[PDB]
Amino acid sequence: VSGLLMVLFKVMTDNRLVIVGETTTPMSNTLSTVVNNVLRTTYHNNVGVN
Amino acid sequence: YGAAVVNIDLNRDFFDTATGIDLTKGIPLVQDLLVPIGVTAGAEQSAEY
Amino acid sequence: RYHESVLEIADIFDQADFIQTSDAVRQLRALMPTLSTSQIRHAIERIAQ
Amino acid sequence: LSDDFKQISDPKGYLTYSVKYEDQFTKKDKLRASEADDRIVGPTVNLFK
Amino acid sequence: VHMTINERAGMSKLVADNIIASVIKSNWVVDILDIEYTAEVMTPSEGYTQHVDAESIMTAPKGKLFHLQFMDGLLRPEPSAFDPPASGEDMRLIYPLQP
User: Fold this and answer.
1) Signal peptide: which range, if any (chain B)?
2) Across the B/D interface, how many CB contacts are shorter than 8 Å?
3) Hey, what's the torsion of the CAs at A30, A36, A42, A44, to 10 degrees?
């Protein structure tokens, strides 16, 4: 229960504020079309996972 | 006599490397004009054409 | 059933003074990768360089 | 007048995928596509390998 | 099968090697549209200075310029009347799609 509390708390205090990070802007011809349909010009280098 | 092939290329002596244009591949190529941003361009890119 | 094609502005305007180009430049632009404004600045800075 | 916000650059989420692989069918080697497509797709294809 | 490959990306090494093996074993005709290359037309006496595995033709980055070579064998003089017969068969895989 206490777990949830400190989860909730840590959310109730996420005063983080995003600022644009390192961001590559790939030349369009170098990307496979399945990726090109997805990309909006530029992405963060830390793409993460989807 | 014995010339197998006679092509018409861009004049490399004119379109010099002072302009940044290589012509050894038979087409003009320029190193860093249309380039990805946030990474190195990579060798032998077709954009160089 | 349509046929897509370029049409030079010269083919419609009789006023020659405001016509500096042709199909050529559009055809060239077709070869270009779509360019983020930052890439456009990189290109201009390079041609300047 | 206030230090109301931290200013992180590449934010971490509250949730993540976690993956257990079956060692017998998994290949230890990192997957390699084209360099660009790996810069984007790569962290994913390696997680859901 | 006149197979057409628009985009090599994401293709497995197994699948590619199998397509090639199908070109050789089943006489598949495999167009690959995604290759951008710069041909150099060699004369027969200069041979082929620069070589290309089928593997590299299949697995090269989508944006990179390949550099193929193509012989013009118009100026190759006839064999002598008594040169030994050739049992072997010279073979070829890569061709241009356009002039």
Assistant:
1) none
2) 3
3) -90
